[PDB]
Design a protein around this motif. Structure first.
Motif, PDB file in Angstrom:
ATOM      1  N   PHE A 147       0.676  -1.169   0.077  1.00  0.00           N
ATOM      2  CA  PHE A 147       0.245  -0.037  -0.044  1.00  0.00           C
ATOM      3  C   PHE A 147       0.771   1.105  -0.183  1.00  0.00           C
ATOM      4  O   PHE A 147       0.125   2.632  -0.242  1.00  0.00           O
ATOM      5  CB  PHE A 147      -0.640   0.223   1.548  1.00  0.00           C
ATOM      6  N   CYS A 148       1.874   0.464   0.162  1.00  0.00           N
ATOM      7  CA  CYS A 148       3.248   1.720   0.763  1.00  0.00           C
ATOM      8  C   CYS A 148       3.643   2.634  -0.845  1.00  0.00           C
ATOM      9  O   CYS A 148       4.338   1.945  -1.462  1.00  0.00           O
ATOM     10  CB  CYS A 148       3.943   1.752   1.037  1.00  0.00           C
ATOM     11  N   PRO A 149       3.131   4.497  -1.226  1.00  0.00           N
ATOM     12  CA  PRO A 149       3.366   4.767  -2.489  1.00  0.00           C
ATOM     13  C   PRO A 149       5.039   4.849  -2.893  1.00  0.00           C
ATOM     14  O   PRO A 149       5.141   4.561  -3.715  1.00  0.00           O
ATOM     15  CB  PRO A 149       3.002   6.009  -2.373  1.00  0.00           C
ATOM     16  N   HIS A 150       5.471   5.341  -1.739  1.00  0.00           N
ATOM     17  CA  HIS A 150       7.659   5.144  -1.780  1.00  0.00           C
ATOM     18  C   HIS A 150       8.052   3.647  -2.005  1.00  0.00           C
ATOM     19  O   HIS A 150       8.541   3.511  -3.054  1.00  0.00           O
ATOM     20  CB  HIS A 150       7.830   6.071  -0.787  1.00  0.00           C
ATOM     21  N   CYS A 151       7.549   2.640  -1.575  1.00  0.00           N
ATOM     22  CA  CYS A 151       7.756   1.443  -1.465  1.00  0.00           C
ATOM     23  C   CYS A 151       7.499   0.790  -3.146  1.00  0.00           C
ATOM     24  O   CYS A 151       8.537   0.566  -3.572  1.00  0.00           O
ATOM     25  CB  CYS A 151       6.763   0.808  -0.560  1.00  0.00           C
ATOM     26  N   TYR A 152       6.355   1.614  -3.957  1.00  0.00           N
ATOM     27  CA  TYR A 152       6.118   1.482  -5.080  1.00  0.00           C
ATOM     28  C   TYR A 152       7.057   1.160  -5.689  1.00  0.00           C
ATOM     29  O   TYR A 152       7.868   0.771  -6.529  1.00  0.00           O
ATOM     30  CB  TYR A 152       4.674   1.613  -5.692  1.00  0.00           C
ATOM     31  N   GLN A 153       7.664   2.600  -5.876  1.00  0.00           N
ATOM     32  CA  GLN A 153       8.818   3.269  -6.276  1.00  0.00           C
ATOM     33  C   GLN A 153      10.323   2.212  -5.856  1.00  0.00           C
ATOM     34  O   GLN A 153      10.620   2.437  -6.948  1.00  0.00           O
ATOM     35  CB  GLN A 153       9.132   4.727  -6.151  1.00  0.00           C
ATOM     36  N   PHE A 154      10.349   2.528  -4.833  1.00  0.00           N
ATOM     37  CA  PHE A 154      11.505   1.549  -4.923  1.00  0.00           C
ATOM     38  C   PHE A 154      11.556   0.248  -5.094  1.00  0.00           C
ATOM     39  O   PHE A 154      12.511  -0.729  -5.253  1.00  0.00           O
ATOM     40  CB  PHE A 154      11.458   1.381  -3.551  1.00  0.00           C
ATOM     41  N   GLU A 155      11.054  -0.590  -5.428  1.00  0.00           N
ATOM     42  CA  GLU A 155      10.764  -1.201  -6.405  1.00  0.00           C
ATOM     43  C   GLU A 155      10.956  -2.005  -7.342  1.00  0.00           C
ATOM     44  O   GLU A 155      11.281  -2.121  -7.430  1.00  0.00           O
ATOM     45  CB  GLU A 155       9.459  -2.239  -6.021  1.00  0.00           C
ATOM     46  N   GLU A 156       9.890  -1.090  -8.173  1.00  0.00           N
ATOM     47  CA  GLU A 156       8.676  -0.872  -9.734  1.00  0.00           C
ATOM     48  C   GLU A 156      10.710  -0.176 -10.570  1.00  0.00           C
ATOM     49  O   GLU A 156      10.936  -0.248 -11.875  1.00  0.00           O
ATOM     50  CB  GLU A 156       7.878  -0.509  -9.704  1.00  0.00           C
ATOM     51  N   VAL A 157      10.729   1.150  -9.766  1.00  0.00           N
ATOM     52  CA  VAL A 157      11.335   2.011 -10.372  1.00  0.00           C
ATOM     53  C   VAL A 157      13.195   2.137 -10.232  1.00  0.00           C
ATOM     54  O   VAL A 157      13.581   2.368 -10.552  1.00  0.00           O
ATOM     55  CB  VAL A 157      10.682   3.473 -10.331  1.00  0.00           C
ATOM     56  N   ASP A 178       9.280 -12.645  -6.038  1.00  0.00           N
ATOM     57  CA  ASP A 178      10.413 -12.806  -7.603  1.00  0.00           C
ATOM     58  C   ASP A 178       9.051 -12.574  -8.532  1.00  0.00           C
ATOM     59  O   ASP A 178       8.782 -12.538  -9.353  1.00  0.00           O
ATOM     60  CB  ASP A 178      11.995 -12.981  -7.950  1.00  0.00           C
ATOM     61  N   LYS A 179       8.315 -13.597  -8.398  1.00  0.00           N
ATOM     62  CA  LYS A 179       6.721 -13.864  -8.953  1.00  0.00           C
ATOM     63  C   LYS A 179       5.847 -12.738  -8.779  1.00  0.00           C
ATOM     64  O   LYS A 179       5.145 -12.622  -9.957  1.00  0.00           O
ATOM     65  CB  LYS A 179       6.707 -15.168  -9.250  1.00  0.00           C
ATOM     66  N   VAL A 180       5.855 -12.805  -7.514  1.00  0.00           N
ATOM     67  CA  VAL A 180       4.128 -11.484  -7.096  1.00  0.00           C
ATOM     68  C   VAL A 180       4.246 -10.292  -6.578  1.00  0.00           C
ATOM     69  O   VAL A 180       3.864  -9.860  -6.908  1.00  0.00           O
ATOM     70  CB  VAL A 180       3.761 -12.673  -6.056  1.00  0.00           C
ATOM     71  N   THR A 181       6.064 -10.065  -6.185  1.00  0.00           N
ATOM     72  CA  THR A 181       5.839  -8.892  -6.439  1.00  0.00           C
ATOM     73  C   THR A 181       5.363  -7.605  -7.275  1.00  0.00           C
ATOM     74  O   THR A 181       4.878  -6.778  -6.542  1.00  0.00           O
ATOM     75  CB  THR A 181       7.936  -8.525  -5.803  1.00  0.00           C
ATOM     76  N   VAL A 182       5.636  -8.098  -8.287  1.00  0.00           N
ATOM     77  CA  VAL A 182       5.076  -6.853  -9.015  1.00  0.00           C
ATOM     78  C   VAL A 182       3.689  -6.428  -9.406  1.00  0.00           C
ATOM     79  O   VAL A 182       2.987  -5.745  -8.894  1.00  0.00           O
ATOM     80  CB  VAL A 182       5.751  -6.964 -10.591  1.00  0.00           C
ATOM     81  N   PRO A 183       3.046  -7.967  -9.711  1.00  0.00           N
ATOM     82  CA  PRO A 183       1.840  -8.129  -9.378  1.00  0.00           C
ATOM     83  C   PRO A 183       1.481  -7.465  -8.345  1.00  0.00           C
ATOM     84  O   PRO A 183      -0.294  -6.877  -8.591  1.00  0.00           O
ATOM     85  CB  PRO A 183       1.241  -9.658 -10.293  1.00  0.00           C
ATOM     86  N   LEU A 184       1.509  -7.936  -7.537  1.00  0.00           N
ATOM     87  CA  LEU A 184       0.481  -7.533  -6.212  1.00  0.00           C
ATOM     88  C   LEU A 184       1.169  -5.921  -5.757  1.00  0.00           C
ATOM     89  O   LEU A 184       0.080  -4.889  -5.614  1.00  0.00           O
ATOM     90  CB  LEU A 184       1.334  -8.554  -5.195  1.00  0.00           C
ATOM     91  N   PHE A 185       2.082  -5.451  -5.976  1.00  0.00           N
ATOM     92  CA  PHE A 185       2.075  -3.837  -6.322  1.00  0.00           C
ATOM     93  C   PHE A 185       1.256  -3.341  -7.059  1.00  0.00           C
ATOM     94  O   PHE A 185       0.594  -1.887  -6.908  1.00  0.00           O
ATOM     95  CB  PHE A 185       3.308  -3.183  -6.257  1.00  0.00           C
ATOM     96  N   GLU A 186       0.962  -3.852  -8.300  1.00  0.00           N
ATOM     97  CA  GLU A 186       0.426  -3.242  -9.789  1.00  0.00           C
ATOM     98  C   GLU A 186      -0.981  -3.409  -9.273  1.00  0.00           C
ATOM     99  O   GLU A 186      -2.018  -2.377  -9.663  1.00  0.00           O
ATOM    100  CB  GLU A 186       1.211  -3.920 -11.299  1.00  0.00           C
ATOM    101  N   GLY A 187      -1.237  -4.680  -8.500  1.00  0.00           N
ATOM    102  CA  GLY A 187      -2.832  -5.227  -8.472  1.00  0.00           C
ATOM    103  C   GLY A 187      -3.219  -4.108  -6.984  1.00  0.00           C
ATOM    104  O   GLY A 187      -4.868  -3.315  -7.266  1.00  0.00           O
TER     105      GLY A 187
END
Length: 188
Positions: free
Chosen positions: A29-39, A86-95
């Motif tokens: 749910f954390c917006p900076h966390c999304y940035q940390f992970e995908e960007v 490493d298989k669910v991190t991206v789809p969980l963040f985007e979901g």
């Protein structure tokens, strides 16, 4: 000096014994966390610069997103237990943050199914005591450092990264300062 307590990092006045060497907290749910992970790919760039022998740990937290937040902590325990981070991190963040198609425990489960974890394997893990104790571990690690915000990273239970005391004009440069700071704390 170059690295200074209170600038690139802070020191825990109440150090945590037996803590993981490099410990990262996040929330889906954390917006900076999304940035940390995908960007920014923080965890990955830290890893590439860590010494010999240092283990990296990442835990989910409850204090964002209410009921779904707790569900996500249990799902992250499932992810760790099955070794499918490493298989669910991206789809969980985007979901949660991009498509906003994750609104229930069932929707979380769908991400794992779509990633190729069998339903029966997901459900067995979800309900397992091993996952219950992995939830307990995540909760205890966060409680021990009195954690109020994410993203967060702690080194040897004694230092906390302080990214606000870092440059953000250039994304690449911020990431390496963060990583280099982790290496420094590591060697301290």
């Amino acid at each position: 000096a170059q690295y200074e307590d209170g600038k690139q990092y802070t020191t825990l006045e109440k150090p945590v014994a037996g803590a993981p060497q490099v410990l990262e907290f996040f929330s889906f749910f954390c917006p900076h966390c999304y940035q940390f992970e995908e960007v920014l790919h923080i965890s990955d760039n830290v890893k590439k610069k860590l010494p010999e022998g240092v283990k990296m740990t990442k835990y989910h937290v409850n204090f964002m997103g209410g009921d779904l937040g707790k569900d996500l902590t249990q799902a992250w325990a499932v992810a760790m237990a099955l070794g499918v981070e490493d298989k669910v991190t991206v789809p969980l963040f985007e979901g949660v943050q991009k498509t906003q198609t994750i609104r229930s425990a069932s929707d979380i489960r769908d991400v794992f199914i779509n990633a190729g974890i069998k339903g029966e394997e997901y459900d067995a893990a979800w309900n397992s005591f091993v996952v219950k104790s992995l939830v307990a571990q995540q909760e205890k690690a966060a409680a021990d450092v009195q954690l109020r915000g994410v993203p967060a990273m702690f080194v040897n239970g004694k230092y906390q990264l302080n990214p606000q005391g870092m440059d953000t004009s250039n994304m690449d440069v911020f990431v390496q300062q963060y990583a280099d700071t982790v290496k420094y704390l590591s060697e301290k």
